[PDB]
Amino acid sequence: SGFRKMAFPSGKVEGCMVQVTCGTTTLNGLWLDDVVYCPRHVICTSEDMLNPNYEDLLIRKSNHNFLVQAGNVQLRVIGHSMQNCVLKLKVDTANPKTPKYKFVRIQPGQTFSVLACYNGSPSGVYQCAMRPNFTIKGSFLNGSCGSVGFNIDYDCVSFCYMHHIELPTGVHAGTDLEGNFYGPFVDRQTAQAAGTDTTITVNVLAWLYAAVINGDRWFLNRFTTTLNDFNLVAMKYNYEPLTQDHVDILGPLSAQTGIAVLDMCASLKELLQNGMNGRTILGSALLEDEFTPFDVVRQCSGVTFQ
Amino acid sequence: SGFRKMAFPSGKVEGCMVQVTCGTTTLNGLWLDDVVYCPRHVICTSEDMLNPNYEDLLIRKSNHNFLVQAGNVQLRVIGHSMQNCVLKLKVDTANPKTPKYKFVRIQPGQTFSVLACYNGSPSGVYQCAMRPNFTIKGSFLNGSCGSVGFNIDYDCVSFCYMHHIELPTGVHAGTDLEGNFYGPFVDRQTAQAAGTDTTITVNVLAWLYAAVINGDRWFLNRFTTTLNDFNLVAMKYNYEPLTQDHVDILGPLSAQTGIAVLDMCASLKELLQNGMNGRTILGSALLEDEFTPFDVVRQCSGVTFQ
Ligand SMILES: *C(=N)[C@H](C[C@@H]1CCNC1=O)NC(=O)[C@@H]1Cc2ccccc2CN1C(=O)[C@@H](NC(=O)C(F)(F)F)C(C)(C)C
Ligand SMILES: *C(=N)[C@H](C[C@@H]1CCNC1=O)NC(=O)[C@@H]1Cc2ccccc2CN1C(=O)[C@@H](NC(=O)C(F)(F)F)C(C)(C)C
Ligand code: NA
Ligand code: NA
Ligand code: NA
Ligand code: NA
Numbered sequence: 001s002g003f004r005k006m007a008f009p010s011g012k013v014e015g016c017m018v019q020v021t022c023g024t025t026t027l028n029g030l031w032l033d034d035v036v037y038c039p040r041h042v043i044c045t046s047e048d049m050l051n052p053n054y055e056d057l058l059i060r061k062s063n064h065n066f067l068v069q070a071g072n073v074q075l076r077v078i079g080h081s082m083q084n085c086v087l088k089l090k091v092d093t094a095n096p097k098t099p100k101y102k103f104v105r106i107q108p109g110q111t112f113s114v115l116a117c118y119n120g121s122p123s124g125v126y127q128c129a130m131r132p133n134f135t136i137k138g139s140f141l142n143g144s145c146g147s148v149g150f151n152i153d154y155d156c157v158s159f160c161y162m163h164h165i166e167l168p169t170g171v172h173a174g175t176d177l178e179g180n181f182y183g184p185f186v187d188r189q190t191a192q193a194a195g196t197d198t199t200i201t202v203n204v205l206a207w208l209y210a211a212v213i214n215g216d217r218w219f220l221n222r223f224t225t226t227l228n229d230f231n232l233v234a235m236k237y238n239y240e241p242l243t244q245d246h247v248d249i250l251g252p253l254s255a256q257t258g259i260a261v262l263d264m265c266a267s268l269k270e271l272l273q274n275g276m277n278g279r280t281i282l283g284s285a286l287l288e289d290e291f292t293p294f295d296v297v298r299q300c301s302g303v304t305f306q
Numbered sequence: 307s308g309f310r311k312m313a314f315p316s317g318k319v320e321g322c323m324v325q326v327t328c329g330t331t332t333l334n335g336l337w338l339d340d341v342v343y344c345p346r347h348v349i350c351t352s353e354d355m356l357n358p359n360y361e362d363l364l365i366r367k368s369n370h371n372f373l374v375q376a377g378n379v380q381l382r383v384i385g386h387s388m389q390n391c392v393l394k395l396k397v398d399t400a401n402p403k404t405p406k407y408k409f410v411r412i413q414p415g416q417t418f419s420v421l422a423c424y425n426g427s428p429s430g431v432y433q434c435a436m437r438p439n440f441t442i443k444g445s446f447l448n449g450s451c452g453s454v455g456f457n458i459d460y461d462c463v464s465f466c467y468m469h470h471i472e473l474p475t476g477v478h479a480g481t482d483l484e485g486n487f488y489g490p491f492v493d494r495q496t497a498q499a500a501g502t503d504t505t506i507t508v509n510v511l512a513w514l515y516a517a518v519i520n521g522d523r524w525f526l527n528r529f530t531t532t533l534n535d536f537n538l539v540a541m542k543y544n545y546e547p548l549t550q551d552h553v554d555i556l557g558p559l560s561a562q563t564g565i566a567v568l569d570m571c572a573s574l575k576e577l578l579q580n581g582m583n584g585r586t587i588l589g590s591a592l593l594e595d596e597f598t599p600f601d602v603v604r605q606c607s608g609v610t611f612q
Pocket of ligand 6: 526527529530568569570571572573
C-alpha cells in the first residue's frame with residue numbers, strides 16, 4: 001500500500017555525470033562512451049548573452065578551451081561539435097560506467113526523473129512532468145544546467161531532458177539530448193515566458209485509479225458521461241482534452257479496478273464542479289496530474305529494473 | 307527556484323542490494339563488506355506467524371538453508387546470527403561496491419530516502435519522514451521487506467531504516483539496521499496498529515521558510531507570539547510541541563530570510579486558525595511537514611555529495 005512521487009533509481013545516471021568548464025562558466029555534462037554532452041551556452045560570456053551567434057563563438061574555440069573533469073580525473077577533449085543547442089565534446093576516454101541507453105524526445109504529459117547536479121556531482125533526484133506548455137516545475141539553482149531527466153526500462157536508460165534555463169515564473173526549460181528545446185524557448189536572454197498551462201487530464205484519471213487501487217473510493221459516483229460531454233467540462237476547468245487514445249491507455253487500470261474510463265470521468269467531473277470538500281485523495285488536497293498511467297501500474301505492481 | 311520532494315541519489319545503495327531466500331520466502335538484503343543484513347522474518351513459515359520463537363526457528367537452520375543472490379551471482383553463506391529483528395548472513399565475498407557507511411537510529415521528524423526493492427532489484431526512490439507515531443507513509447508491496455532508508459552526507463551513506471511490516475491503515479513499520487523497531491511494533495502477526503499521529507511542527511516551519519526563500523510571502527503577517535502561546539495553539543491542532551531546540555535549529559533559515567522564528571510561528575498560527583483560503587504554498591494546498599530544516603537548506607543551497 002501507499003502511493004509516492006517515485007523517481008527511478010539514479011545510479012546508472014550518477015556514473016555518467018561530469019563537470020565541464022569553458023572560460024569562467026562551469027556546469028554539468030553527460031558522459032556516455034567517449035562523448036560528453038552539455039548545453040552549448042557554456043561557451044557564452046556574460047557580455048554576449050542577448051544575441052549570441054553560437055557558430056561564431058564556437059569556431060573561435062579549441063579543444064583545450066574545454067576542461068572536463070570526472071571525479072578528480074581530467075578528461076582530455078580531442079574533438080568538439082555543436083548539435084542544435086548541445087555541445088558534444090569527444091574525450092580521450094570512454095566512460096566505463098556507460099549504461100545501456102537511448103535518447104528520447106518525450107511528449108507533454110510524460111514524466112521523468114531528474115538528477116539535479118552541481119559541479120559534476122549529484123545533489124538529489126525527483127520526479128517531474130513535461131507540462132503541456134513545455135516547461136517543467138523543477139528545482140534548479142545556479143550551476144545546475146546540464147542536469148538530465150530520464151526514464152529507465154529494464155536495463156535501458158532513456159534520457160529525455162537536459163536543463164538549460166529558468167523562466168520568470170521560476171519554472172524550467174531545456175532540450176532533448178539532441179539539443180532541441182521543448183516548447184518555443186531559446187538559449188538567449190530574451191523576454192520569453194511560459195505560456196498558459198493546462199492540467200494533464202489522462203494523468204489525473206490515472207491517479208484517481210491509483211487511489212481506488214489503494215482502497216479509497218469516496219469520490220466515485222454512479223453516473224457516467226460521454227467523452228464529448230466530459231471534454232466540454234474539461235475545457236471549462238483548463239484541463240487538456242481527453243482523446244480516445246487516452247481512454248485506451250487507461251484500459252488496464254479500468255480493467256484492474258472494474259471502473260469504466262468514462263465512469264471515472266464522471267467522478268472527475270463531479271470533483272471539478274464540487275471540489276473535494278476538505279477531503280483528501282492519496283494525501284493530496286489537489287488533483288494530482290504528474291503520474292502517468294504507466295507510473296501508476298509501475299508502483300502498484302512493483303516493476304523493477306535490471 | 308523550485309521546491310521538490312527530493313531524495314538522495316540512490317547509486318551507492320543500489321550496489322548493496324541483494325536477494326535472500328529461505329524456504330519459500332524471498333525478500334531483500336543489504337550487502338556491506340562480507341555481511342548481508344535482512345529481516346529475520348525471512349525464516350518464518352506461514353504457519354508459525356502468530357507467535358514465532360525466532361531463536362528456536364533459527365537454531366534449526368544451517369547456512370545452506372539461506373540462498374543469497376547478487377545480480378546473477380550466488381553468494382555462499384558461511385555464517386549467520388540474529389541481532390534483534392535482523393539476520394546477519396556472513397558470505398564468502400566482500401561487496402566490492404560497499405560505500406563508506408554508518409548505521410544510525412533516527413528521531414521522529416527526521417527524513418530519509420527509501421530505495422524500494424523487489425527480488426534484490428531497485429524499483430524506485432522516494433522521500434519519507436519518520437512520523438511522531440514511529441510509522442512511515444511509504445509505498446511498499448509484497449516482497450519489499452529488506453528495502454532500506456538512508457541519508458547521504460558527503461561520501462557517507464547513513465542507513466537508518468529497514469522495512470518489515472505494513473499496518474492496517476496502510477502505513478509502514480520497520481527497524482534500524484541493528485534490528486530495533488521504531489515504535490512499539492513487533493515482527494509477529496498481532497493486533498498492532500499505528501497510534502494517533504501528530505504534525506511535525508518544526509518541519510512545517512522549515513517549509514514556510516522554503517516558500518519565502520522561493521519568493522512567496524502571502525501567508526506572512528505582522529504579529530509575533532510567545533513559544534508558550536504558540537504551543538497552546540499547536541496542541542489544539544494536533545501539532546507537535548515546538549521546543550527551544552527546534553527554535554535554535556531554525557536559526558539559519560530565520561537569518562537568511564530575516565523572519566524571526568516566533569514571527570513565523572505567528573504566521574503558522576493564523577494559517578491554522580484561518581486556513582489557506584484556496585491559496586497554495588509551494589504548490590500544496592496542505593501544510594507540508596516532511597521537509598526538515600536541513601532538507602530546506604540542502605535544496606535551497608545545492609549541497610552535493612561525493
Ligand atoms: C544553468 N546553470 C542555469 C540554470 C538556471 C539558473 C537559475 N535556475 C536555473 O535553472 N541556466 C541559466 O542561467 C541560463 C543560461 C543562459 C543562456 C543563454 C541566455 C541567457 C542565459 C541565462 N539563463 C537563465 O536561465 C535566465 N533566464 C532567462 O534567460 C529566460 F528567463 F529564460 F529568458 C536567468 C535564470 C534569469 C539567469
Ligand atoms: C515484506 N515483504 C512485507 C511487506 C508488506 C507486505 C505488504 N506491504 C508491506 O509493506 N512484510 C510482511 O508481509 C509482514 C511479515 C510478517 C512478519 C511477522 C508476522 C507477520 C508478518 C506479515 N507482514 C505484514 O506486514 C502484515 N501486517 C501485520 O502483520 C501487522 F499489521 F503489522 F500486524 C500484512 C501486511 C497483513 C501481511
Ligand atoms: Na563561457
Ligand atoms: Na462514476
Ligand atoms: Na521461510
Ligand atoms: Na508573523
